[PDB]
Structure formats: C-alpha cells, structure tokens
Design a protein around this ligand. Sequence first.
Ligand SMILES: O=c1ccn([C@H]2C[C@H](O)[C@@H](COP(=O)(O)O)O2)c(=O)[nH]1
Ligand SMILES: O=c1ccn([C@H]2C[C@H](O)[C@@H](COP(=O)(O)O)O2)c(=O)[nH]1
Ligand SMILES: [Mg+2]
Ligand SMILES: [Mg+2]
Ligand SMILES: [Mg+2]
Ligand SMILES: [Mg+2]
Ligand SMILES: [Mg+2]
Ligand SMILES: [Mg+2]
Lengths: 222, 222
Amino acid sequence: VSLSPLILRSLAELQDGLNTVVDKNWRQLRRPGDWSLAITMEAAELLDSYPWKWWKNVKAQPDLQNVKIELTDILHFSLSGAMQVSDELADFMFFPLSDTNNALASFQNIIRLASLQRFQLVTSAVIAAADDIGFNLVAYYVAKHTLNGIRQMKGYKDGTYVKVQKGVEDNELLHGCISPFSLDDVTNEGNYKTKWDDIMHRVYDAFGTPKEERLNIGHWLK
Amino acid sequence: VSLSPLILRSLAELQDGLNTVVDKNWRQLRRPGDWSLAITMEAAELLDSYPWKWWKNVKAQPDLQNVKIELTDILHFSLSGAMQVSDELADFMFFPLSDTNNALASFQNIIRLASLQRFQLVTSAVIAAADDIGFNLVAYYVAKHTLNGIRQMKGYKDGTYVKVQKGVEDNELLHGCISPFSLDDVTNEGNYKTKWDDIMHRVYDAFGTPKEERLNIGHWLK
Ligand SMILES: O=c1ccn([C@H]2C[C@H](O)[C@@H](COP(=O)(O)O)O2)c(=O)[nH]1
Ligand SMILES: O=c1ccn([C@H]2C[C@H](O)[C@@H](COP(=O)(O)O)O2)c(=O)[nH]1
Ligand SMILES: [Mg+2]
Ligand SMILES: [Mg+2]
Ligand SMILES: [Mg+2]
Ligand SMILES: [Mg+2]
Ligand SMILES: [Mg+2]
Ligand SMILES: [Mg+2]
C-alpha cells in the first residue's frame, strides 16, 4: 500500500541527487512532460518483458526478473515527476500481476497515468505492484540508483557506454547485490541508511568502481 | 488529408490477407485491445527514433528514415483495429513534424488515440504525417507488407528469424525497393495494382525469395 513517509523522503533525496549528477540545474531544465515520456518508454520496456506478440516468437516466456528492473526504473521517473507537479488504485491495477493479462492491462494503465502527470499515483502503483509480485522495491531502487550513477561516470550521456558485455546486461548483476537484504533491513527506522550504504558498495564492487570514485550514502542524503 | 477510398479499401484487403497469414481465424482470436497495445509499442519505437533522452547519448541524431518504417507499422495495426471497431486532427498532431518537439508530442498523442481505440483517427494521423514529412506512405505500406509476409515464411512466429544481419536491419532494404515509385504510380486509379505488384517483387528480390514461394498482388485482393 504505502512506504513510510521517512523512507519515501529519503528515496526522493536520492532521486534529486541522481538527477543533479545528470544535470546540475535539472530543476530548471526538465519539465513534467519529460517525465511522462520517460515513464511511457519504461512502461513499454516493462510490457516487452512479456510474450504479448501473437506474430513473433509466440511461445516465448516472460522475463519476470526484468519486470522488477523496469518497475524500479518507473519509480525513479515517478519520484522525479512528483518533485515538479503534485497530482493536483483498484480502477487501474489488476491483481495478481502473475497473470499476464492482468499485467498487460495494469502496465498499459501506467502509461495513461503518466500522460495525465499523475506521478504520485504512478509511485503508488509501483509500490503496490512490488507488494503483489513480492520483490524488495526499496533495495531494487538503491541498487539501480547506484548503477545509474556508475553509468554516468562511464559515459552513458556521451554515448560511449556498453550495457551488455560478454552476454550479461549490467542490470542482471543487480539481483545478487540485493538478495542478501530483507525488507526489514532496508526500511528499519534506525538502521536503514547503513543497509542502503551496504547495497551501494555491493553494486560498486560488481562494476569494479575504484574506491576514490565511490559515493557513499551520505553523499545523497539531506 | 485522405487517401482515395478505393486505395484505402485495397490496403485494408492487403492487411486482412496478412493478418490471415499470421492466423487463419485472426478475426475471432484478436480483440481491439491487442491493436491498441501493438500501436502503443510501435509508437514507442517511433519515439525512440529521436534523441529524446537527456541522460543517454545526448548528442545523438534522429533516425528519420526509421520514422517512416514505424509510421508504416502503425498503419498496419490501425487498419487492423478499424476492421474490429469503428471509432463509434489539429488537436493532437503538430506540424511541421521535422521539429523534434512537435514529433514527440504528436507521436505521444498517437498512443492516447490508440488507447481510446480511435483506430480510424490513428490512420488519418499517419496519412497526415506522411503528407507532412513527404514520404510515400502507400509504397512504404506495400513494401513492409511484403517483408512482413517474408518474415512469417522465415520463422518470425517461432523465434528463429534474425532481423539484423551483417550490419543491416531487414527494414533498411525497403527504402531502395520503393524509391523508383512515385505517389502517382501507386495511387493511379487504373494502374496502381501493377505498381504494387512491382514493389512486391522488388522486396522478394531483396530477400532472395524463391519464385515458387512468392505471392503476387492478386493473392491479396478481393
Ligand atoms: O534524469 C534522470 C534520467 C534518468 N534516470 C534513470 C532512471 C532509470 O532508472 C534509468 C533508465 O536509464 P535507461 O536504461 O532507460 O537508459 O535512468 C534518472 O534517474 N534521472
Ligand atoms: O497480426 C499482425 C501482426 C503483425 N503485423 C505486422 C505489422 C507491422 O508492420 C509488423 C511489426 O512487426 P515487428 O517488427 O514489431 O515485430 O507486424 C501485422 O500486419 N498483423
Ligand atoms: Mg530505459
Ligand atoms: Mg530495460
Ligand atoms: Mg528500463
Ligand atoms: Mg515492432
Ligand atoms: Mg523498429
Ligand atoms: Mg516497428
């Protein structure tokens, strides 16, 4: 249903920090329609994790691990949209999402909500989806946030980064960085920041980031 | 603005024939929401032909030739949707489409129209876009229709087809199959069918289709 407001605020802080790595003055440069488009396009990636096409590889299997990654990407963009516009559940999300027909309908409705700039509702939708599917959305967020920062360090913005190397997409390495961590670990009121820092360092390890280039949890929090 | 109704009807006939190659009973198996999803996903391909991302290869150039292909793909799906539901312009398309901001807005609005199952309006939008950009939509349709059929012959539906070979995407070969043909050639009331047949054989040539496997224009027309 919902995250603790203190956890949500820390996620928002991380998101602002990441947006600032991309551009120092992102709050002036970006507009709500940018985040609508970004969510639309991640939702298309999410939809394409399923075998929806009736004319192309009809017996393909759903990439349910990639679903987690794309929902996490949507979260980054819905947090970002919410920092620019206030929006001023059971209608548009259909459970269980393990049913492919429910997933295709629900994730198409995320596109509609994005186009209406209902970013907070999109955030609520992703939280509800992670609860239904049963994955650790907060831990996924911290891990992908870290990979996002790594990508920026390694030339994503100037077109020199390569996402798939030796048969492995960078995103795939995140699953094992996160699996040691429980839901309680990453939402505990007193100790969550240390566990987020642990996730970050596991991701930096996975990409061989030199120690001097690593940004710890405190870099991101206000 | 609009095509001749006789030209539109022949396109619809070709579309029905192609849909029948994919599945004999497509008219029972498919539902309007399928075509909405298909158009959404082609519109995402269309949007991704532009350098819209502010965090990833920011100085990339638009793939304006691929725009033509993706609009043509949308047409196939909007024709198909219109065969299942009646819908029972200047608001949602913004010219010139050579302006990237106009294109991103317009093509996002195609997604909205698709989700509303306004398939005839989507068709009108594609016709208007081709008129504005200045490409031969009918010739593009016939060429991609032919490649679509070829793909089905070569295992697209069972996952054995390879779209990009030796650095060239199959779609790229279509441009040169079409460039000899004028707008008048492919819409002339008396002779258009022969010119469509010519396009088809040029596409079969490009993919080395044995003569016995080729389907001529008459296969597709009622
Ligand atoms: O201003 C931005 C731009 C991008 N992203 C992140 C969010 C997603 O997790 C990720 C998606 O990158 P792609 O793989 O689509 O390129 O980018 C941000 O957080 N802020
Ligand atoms: O029932 C169908 C399914 C697919 N297509 C065609 C339309 C598009 O031109 C093409 C897109 O194929 P992809 O490259 O997305 O897979 O498929 C049809 O015409 N009818
Ligand atoms: Mg993406
Ligand atoms: Mg992806
Ligand atoms: Mg993604
Ligand atoms: Mg496609
Ligand atoms: Mg394409
Ligand atoms: Mg396409």
